[PDB]
Enzyme design. Structure first.
Site, PDB file in Angstrom:
ATOM      1  N   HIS C  82       0.849  -1.182   0.000  1.00 33.02           N
ATOM      2  CA  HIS C  82       0.000   0.000   0.000  1.00 33.02           C
ATOM      3  C   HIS C  82       0.888   1.236   0.000  1.00 33.02           C
ATOM      4  CE1 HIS C  82       0.590  -0.256   4.442  1.00 33.02           C
ATOM      5  NE2 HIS C  82       0.474   1.059   4.386  1.00 33.02           N
ATOM      6  N   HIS C  84       1.746   4.239   1.388  1.00 37.17           N
ATOM      7  CA  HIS C  84       1.968   5.171   2.484  1.00 37.17           C
ATOM      8  C   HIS C  84       3.438   5.571   2.515  1.00 37.17           C
ATOM      9  CE1 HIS C  84      -1.872   4.437   5.089  1.00 37.17           C
ATOM     10  NE2 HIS C  84      -1.964   5.551   4.385  1.00 37.17           N
ATOM     11  N   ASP C  86       5.809   5.303   4.811  1.00 36.10           N
ATOM     12  CA  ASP C  86       6.758   4.341   5.354  1.00 36.10           C
ATOM     13  C   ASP C  86       6.839   3.057   4.539  1.00 36.10           C
ATOM     14  OD1 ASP C  86       4.076   3.744   6.365  1.00 36.10           O
ATOM     15  OD2 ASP C  86       5.039   2.223   7.611  1.00 36.10           O
ATOM     16  N   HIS C  87       6.232   3.011   3.354  1.00 35.85           N
ATOM     17  CA  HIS C  87       6.280   1.806   2.535  1.00 35.85           C
ATOM     18  C   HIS C  87       6.596   2.137   1.082  1.00 35.85           C
ATOM     19  CE1 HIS C  87       4.791  -0.531   5.904  1.00 35.85           C
ATOM     20  NE2 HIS C  87       3.805   0.335   6.051  1.00 35.85           N
ATOM     21  N   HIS C 158      -6.563  -1.392   5.201  1.00 34.97           N
ATOM     22  CA  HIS C 158      -5.632  -0.356   5.640  1.00 34.97           C
ATOM     23  C   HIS C 158      -5.704   0.860   4.726  1.00 34.97           C
ATOM     24  CE1 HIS C 158      -1.996   0.696   8.041  1.00 34.97           C
ATOM     25  NE2 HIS C 158      -1.734   1.443   6.984  1.00 34.97           N
ATOM     26  N   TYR C 189      -7.802   4.495  12.901  1.00 31.76           N
ATOM     27  CA  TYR C 189      -8.878   4.582  11.925  1.00 31.76           C
ATOM     28  C   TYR C 189     -10.227   4.577  12.629  1.00 31.76           C
ATOM     29  CZ  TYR C 189      -5.452   3.277   8.269  1.00 31.76           C
ATOM     30  OH  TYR C 189      -4.381   3.226   7.407  1.00 31.76           O
ATOM     31  N   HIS C 223       5.819  -4.840   7.736  1.00 30.61           N
ATOM     32  CA  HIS C 223       6.471  -4.747   9.031  1.00 30.61           C
ATOM     33  C   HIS C 223       6.743  -6.153   9.538  1.00 30.61           C
ATOM     34  CE1 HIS C 223       4.517  -0.608   9.222  1.00 30.61           C
ATOM     35  NE2 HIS C 223       5.812  -0.375   9.337  1.00 30.61           N
TER      36      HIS C 223
HETATM   37 ZN   LIG Z   1       0.495   2.593   6.065  1.00 24.77          ZN
HETATM   38 ZN   LIG Z   2       2.863   0.855   7.843  1.00 22.41          ZN
END
Ligand SMILES: [Zn+2]
Ligand SMILES: [Zn+2]
Ligand SMILES: CO[C@@](NC(=O)[C@H](C(=O)O)c1ccc(O)cc1)(C(=O)O)[C@@H]1NC(C(=O)O)=C(CSc2nnnn2C)CO1
Ligand SMILES: CO[C@@](NC(=O)[C@H](C(=O)O)c1ccc(O)cc1)(C(=O)O)[C@@H]1NC(C(=O)O)=C(CSc2nnnn2C)CO1
Ligand SMILES: CO[C@@](NC(=O)[C@H](C(=O)O)c1ccc(O)cc1)(C(=O)O)[C@@H]1NC(C(=O)O)=C(CSc2nnnn2C)CO1
Ligand SMILES: CO[C@@](NC(=O)[C@H](C(=O)O)c1ccc(O)cc1)(C(=O)O)[C@@H]1NC(C(=O)O)=C(CSc2nnnn2C)CO1
Ligand SMILES: [Zn+2]
Ligand SMILES: [Zn+2]
Ligand SMILES: [Zn+2]
Ligand SMILES: [Zn+2]
Ligand SMILES: [Zn+2]
Ligand SMILES: [Zn+2]
Lengths: 264, 264, 264, 264
Positions: C82, C84, C86-87, C158, C189, C223
């Site tokens: 996904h 985001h 941090d990815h 997510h 969320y 993660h």
């Molecule tokens: Zn994320």
């Molecule tokens: Zn994450």
């Protein structure tokens, strides 16, 4: 030893000092902060916005607009000087929240599309939410909203898509030619022999000539101190303002001093 | 009386005549059609493509590439002259099918992003599948692929993002400076007093000077007849080719004749 | 009282701890950091990358790739879980620097196009340089690179465009089915009655069922702690790893606990 | 033997037959052509447009809008069913000419961004000027304009981003629930084992159930013959209209007949 944490684009506290709307001419207002210019022109058929400041000024801009009887759906067009974080910041949020259209040139549009990322001189150091340009304009194109005509003057220098805007307002009958010239600064820019911007010098010099020969009786800049404006002292804020010749001639002196200091 | 049916962008039959790869220099090849130029440069680290022709030439271009030992994943970069249907046609399909990257300037990128739609002079008359530019380049930026350096020369005229490309190849040892200049034509363009393109005249005149002072020993154009190339007669196709001065000087004569014919 | 200064997206120091490439299967490697997964699959015709971590890991990823004999022009495709910060962080920079192509679904593409801005739950809190998706893929579409087939499994939860990837590698002959499932977390969320994401609950529950029925012998997560991986202890990093059923069943328990805690 | 000339997307003459605005409810109007639906909802704070037809209907749509006292700057939002040439045609031109905002889901946005090019089933056969989506909406998101609420119902089938819209109008006091369901057809689509659309069957079947359980007293379709509407006979145009159950049940019969005919 981990990789370094990201750094936030922090500015001076004066740049985020919310000020009340200060009138510039009969139809032109300043709605930004003490040291960041955000201009609002109130026409009979809607409102035009020029620049906006930092991205976190979107809520302040809407207040000043609402104070001037301008509802969110009344903002028709957003015009930009150059698309950096401290100038084209809340443009993404203002589009989502007011139903306005962005009018910028190609070089400004492409930068605005990637949120200032991959800047020629700053890289990914400054980055703002990306927005999309709804109308591509050329050098010398006239944008008319509510009978008020905005003419674009390209001044490629600070950014490839730097643009000075000219419009004619009034002052209780007396027509007042307004020029909103972009910053002519090169903060940390590598002028001589830049691979990302090879024709930077000629572009700057040609921009210096452009701003000199502008139809202008009152000049404003994205940063008020560039035109020696003082938004803080209310009415006499335009007293010690510079001319077009004085502005471009002062910027050229600091540019030649920068290029000579760079040879050493 | 219904609204009119859409019209397809039809071209001359010579523009779609598939020809075999014709060698221009040691590393430069022509892989397009008889009257549409598609150039392929074979470096040690990949292949560069310049222009492509009509959108329906994507399958023909891949064949000629495969004939030259170039697999689809070997095409690294796609460079463009200007982004019209008959030149930047199969660029969308070639990206999907070869994993190449498009390098174009801002004005070419924004046009390429809307598939030639809302053309300054043609409107939505010609329209090709839209592609995205992966690298924004400035005037005078050097693009290097496999040790071969391509330098961009902006010639804003035909389109705002017209670009002539210069590279230095060989001819069994003898280095040969190649210039790929864009069309300097204005077919049906309103030159004097154009609202969509206000500075069109000065832009054309400045482009005429640019092409004259190009580092060039052999010139090629997107349309071979513009440089008096004759792709059909194989080896002697470059015999009666024009110079840089002769090309820009001939185009300027037809431009002044066009502007004077337009006053009447 | 000025407007507040922007805050930088700061993460744990473990997320930026550069680790050496750790082998997962015969053709699968981990090249990210100690607590951020970046996967590299080495095929005969190029290299695939799955995720990348924080935006400041672009230079670390290139090193690990160069250690595995993979030059920048050898990275053909970038697949994402996904989008985001941090990815999908260094995805913009990796495209500019390696000539790879991004393959993501529509909901991931549109988010990746605005750099995570206007997140459904974070807003403009996290923001990374925007990238463009080069191939739009559907649920169940097979992407093949160098004979290795990646099949997409949509797990909308997510993010709207969350995607788990399945491929079959080897382990000295023994084929090993690998599943790279996205995070099934909902950190902060608003689950019940979300206006930005109205069908969030059904989407999560349907994602829980999807991950359970995955063809998987060894599972990895963006993660490592989500799958109880321990990249730090080198070889025995996959010892106490969870199953597909155990992962989705544990996530569902924390989701029901979150929704019930939300009624109060 | 040259490569083949491009073919223009030609439709039936009935699709381009300009009709006068035909009232559907107190605030809902039809402004398209005899066999293409273009809906205009007149609220106190602006006008919403749903679909538009072929790209060459932009000038006809503006006339009908002007007849209903709606100036170009009064059109606030453009909602879409699915983004094909014969439905989302003049969306690019209407944005340039009216200052409206497009609200579509991700799968519709990405298709609308490439002008229908690279269609899953038509390829580059149909292509319209590309437009940009200004607001990304999720399944079940409520869009409110002038107090009238539009709720999105995703029906992925015809296109990945097919969307049925539900709003509640009046009929001289009596509230009338309106549903604008997208086409449930599969013209030439390869249903079984499609590589570009692998989950096409389940997506269609789930769409059939969605349209059945819609809050609807009067149904309209992008093509009137799909709902047995007859825009030509003015007032009695809604007489022999179908229900929601009858529409989805008839479409499902033709889908099962199509899938069985496809096994042979
Ligand atoms: Zn994320
Ligand atoms: Zn994450
Ligand atoms: C990107 O924003 C500017 N720079 C910065 O914010 C800081 C920097 O430059 O060091 C970081 C810039 O454009 O250089 C802004 N603009 C001007 C200007 O005068 O235009 C001056 C001078 C500094 O602040
Ligand atoms: C858009 O493509 C061109 N025009 C056309 O295809 C046709 C037209 O122009 O009437 C339609 C153009 O660019 O004008 C192409 N290009 C050149 C050129 O010489 O560049 C010449 C001349 C005509 O054909
Ligand atoms: C946006 O990145 C995440 N959040 C954050 O970085 C921080 C936050 O969420 O408070 C801020 C997120 O996705 O929520 C990331 N991802 C996961 C995850 O497990 O996916 C967890 C949990 C937190 O860190
Ligand atoms: C792309 O536009 C449609 N197709 C075409 O225009 C023609 C085709 O399909 O052969 C070409 C389509 O969507 O299939 C349109 N739409 C419908 C429909 O009923 O939706 C039907 C049936 C045909 O016309
Ligand atoms: Zn700046
Ligand atoms: Zn500045
Ligand atoms: Zn052309
Ligand atoms: Zn041409
Ligand atoms: Zn259709
Ligand atoms: Zn249709």
């Amino acid at each position: 030893a981990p990789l370094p944490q990201l750094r936030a684009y922090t500015v001076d506290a004066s740049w985020l000092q919310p000020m009340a709307p200060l009138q510039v001419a009969d139809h032109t207002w300043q709605i930004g902060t003490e040291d960041l210019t955000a201009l609002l022109v109130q026409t009979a058929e809607g409102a035009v916005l020029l620049d906006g400041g930092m991205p976190q000024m979107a809520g302040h801009l809407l207040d000043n607009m609402k104070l001037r009887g301008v509802a969110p759906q009344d903002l028709r067009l957003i015009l930009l000087s150059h698309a950096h974080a401290d100038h084209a910041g809340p443009v993404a949020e203002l589009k989502r929240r007011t139903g306005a259209h962005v009018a910028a040139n190609a070089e400004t549009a492409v930068l605005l599309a990637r949120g200032g990322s991959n800047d020629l001189h700053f890289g990914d150091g400054i980055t703002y939410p990306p927005a999309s340009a709804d109308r591509i304009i050329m050098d010398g194109e006239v944008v008319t909203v509510g009978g008020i005509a905005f003419t674009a003057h390209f001044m490629p220098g600070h950014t490839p898509g730097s643009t000075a805007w000219t419009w004619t307002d009034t002052r209780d009958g007396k027509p007042v030619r307004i020029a909103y010239a972009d910053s002519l600064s090169a903060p940390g820019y590598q002028l001589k022999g830049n691979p990302r911007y090879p024709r930077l010098i000629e572009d700057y010099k040609r921009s210096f000539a452009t701003v000199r020969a502008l139809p202008c009786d009152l000049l404003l800049t994205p940063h008020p101190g560039a035109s020696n404006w003082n938004y803080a002292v209310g009415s006499k804020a335009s007293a010690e303002a510079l001319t077009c010749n004085a502005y471009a001639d002062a910027a050229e002196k600091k540019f030649d001093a920068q290029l000579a200091r760079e040879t050493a």
